[PDB]
């Protein structure tokens, strides 16, 4: 469940299952790694207008090519079980417009 | 300022029970002379 309060413009949310989960903290804007936080085409997504409702409720599926999903994963230095078998992937949150963010 | 327009209507459990004579009316059509 995602709540976006300072905007009255459309917001998107996309899910990347096969993306390796090698981060333990969310990264924002400029400081995000390039080729990331770029909206993809054929990924599960949901486009929502904040004029109608400013809380997004979605369900992220389990898409791992393995027997289990590993929780309580270490952070910094690998394997092949820590990047594709631990996390459900990454969720990208962006704004439909390129229009500047309000002062507040 | 604020503008409050109150509209109303009758209900189902409402009833006009006893018929009385009609009081003399005024024609709206003669509201200019």
């Amino acid at each position: 469940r995602i709540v976006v309060e300072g905007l009255n413009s459309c917001v998107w949310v996309q899910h990347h299952p096969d993306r390796p989960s090698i981060f333990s903290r969310p990264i924002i804007g400029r400081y995000i790694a390039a080729k990331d936080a770029y909206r993809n085409h054929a990924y599960a997504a949901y486009v929502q207008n904040m004029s109608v409702n400013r809380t997004i409720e979605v369900e992220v599926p389990f898409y791992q090519p393995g027997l289990y999903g590993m929780l309580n994963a270490s952070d910094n230095n690998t394997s092949f079980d820590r990047l594709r078998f631990t996390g459900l992937g990454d969720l990208l949150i962006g704004i439909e417009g390129e229009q500047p963010i309000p002062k507040e | 300022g604020i503008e409050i327009s109150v509209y109303y209507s009758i209900a189902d459990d409402f009833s006009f029970n006893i018929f009385c004579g009609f009081p003399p009316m005024v024609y709206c059509d003669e509201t200019y002379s």
Partner: protein
């Protein structure tokens, strides 16, 4: 177990309220102000009858129309062929055939019959009409009348007895008979007939489909020991086949309040939201020593006037034409004997003070002296006199009682 519900959303159209037009054969959802939140209706008994609002029941009741005298000594009007009484045939009654009560500068009141009042609530109408004629006679009186129903006619410009016999008519005898009814037909080129009188929308009253006329066949004969005058009282009711088509703007109104604002240049009762008003002071108006009409104790709250028509003279002052208020208020002016003794007066006159786009009102006592002072003040403002020279305007002594509602004015 918190199962997901991925069941497609449904396209829905939001609206503010439920139908304003629907009055029957449907449900009207609402927030009942009760303790029981179910289908709830008032309890009843035989002490409290069902609603008596059947249209056929009401419009069946006889209403009285303008009576007329029937003299037998009149050697001119009491002859074979003379037209005694006539009028157009329609549910509503011709204004001149109804009992009237007029008033100076007010609205004319008409004593309409049940069939007429109801019909004024509906656009079209149809059916037979029942005209009951009551005679104030005794056995000695004797006569015969030929009442006719002429379809397609609305006046007596070409109407005579020898022509009325060529249409639907009846011949009543007045031989020991005091009451009878002539149920006139509904002969029309169409199915329903529009009401003669209606809501202000056009400058023309529609026409009735037919005309009823009463003629003399055998002149009324009385005697020496009997009244030569026999008053006739025509009464109207709707036939069993009478129907009313579509609900429209009432062509009638209540006579509870016959006050009206005609096209007569009434001076607009300020603005809406800027009333009630009271006489107060204003720091930008002669350091709050003079009197103006306020609408709030808070500063910068002076009563503003509405749209004053451009056809009003600039040198003209105003007069209260409705409910007014009392207020206490000026020393003698140089060169004249104009002086106002300190006391309580009723507000009557007033002078408009413009300050940009907003216009205010200055109070003046209802006295022969006050009318002349407001007369001059209205003339001084027309010539753009210095603000300091117009100052010697009533004084501000204390605040005054608030008005019930909006005060009206006139040139």
């Amino acid at each position: 177990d918190n199962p997901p519900d991925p069941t497609p959303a449904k396209f829905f159209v939001p609206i503010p309220s439920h139908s304003w037009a629907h009055g029957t054969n449907t449900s009207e959802p609402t927030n009942t102000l009760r303790l029981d939140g179910g289908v709830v209706g008032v309890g009843r008994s035989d002490d409290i009858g069902t609603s008596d609002t059947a249209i056929s029941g009401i419009i069946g009741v006889y209403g009285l129309l303008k009576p007329f005298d029937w003299n037998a000594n009149d050697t001119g009007r009491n002859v074979g062929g003379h037209l005694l009484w006539s009028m157009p045939v329609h549910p509503q009654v011709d204004k001149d055939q109804v009992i009237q009560v007029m008033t100076q500068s007010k609205l004319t009141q008409y004593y309409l019959p049940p069939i007429s009042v109801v019909s004024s609530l509906y656009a079209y109408t149809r059916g037979s009409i029942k005209y009951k004629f009551l005679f104030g006679n005794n056995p000695r009186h004797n006569a015969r009348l030929l009442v006719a129903y002429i379809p397609g006619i609305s006046s007596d410009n070409r109407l005579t007895l020898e022509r009325a016999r060529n249409s639907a008519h009846v011949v009543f005898s007045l031989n020991e008979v005091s009451e009878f009814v002539f149920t006139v037909p509904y002969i029309t080129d169409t199915m329903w007939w529009p009401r003669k009188y209606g809501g202000p929308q056009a400058a023309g009253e529609f026409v009735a489909p037919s005309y009823i006329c009463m003629f003399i066949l055998n002149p009324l004969v009385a005697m020496e020991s009997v009244p030569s005058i026999v008053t006739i009282v025509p009464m109207i009711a709707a036939g069993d086949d009478f129907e009313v088509a579509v609900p429209a703007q009432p062509a009638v109104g209540l006579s509870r309040n016959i006050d009206v604002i005609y096209p007569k240049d009434s001076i607009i009762s300020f603005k809406s939201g800027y009333f009630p008003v009271y006489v107060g002071s204003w720091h930008s108006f002669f350091d709050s020593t003079k009197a103006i009409l306020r609408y709030g104790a808070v500063s910068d709250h002076i009563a503003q006037l509405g749209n004053i028509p451009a056809n009003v003279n600039r040198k003209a002052f105003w007069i209260v034409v409705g409910d007014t208020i009392k207020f206490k208020t000026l020393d003698k002016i140089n060169g004249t004997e104009w002086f106002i003794p300190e006391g309580e007066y009723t507000l009557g006159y007033g002078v408009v003070w413009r300050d940009g786009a907003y216009a205010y009102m200055v109070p003046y006592p209802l006295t022969p002296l006050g009318e002349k002072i407001a007369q001059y003040t209205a003339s001084l403002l027309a010539s753009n006199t210095a603000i300091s020279q117009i100052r010697p305007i009533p004084d501000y002594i204390v605040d005054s009682a608030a008005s019930k509602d909006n005060i009206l004015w006139s040139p």
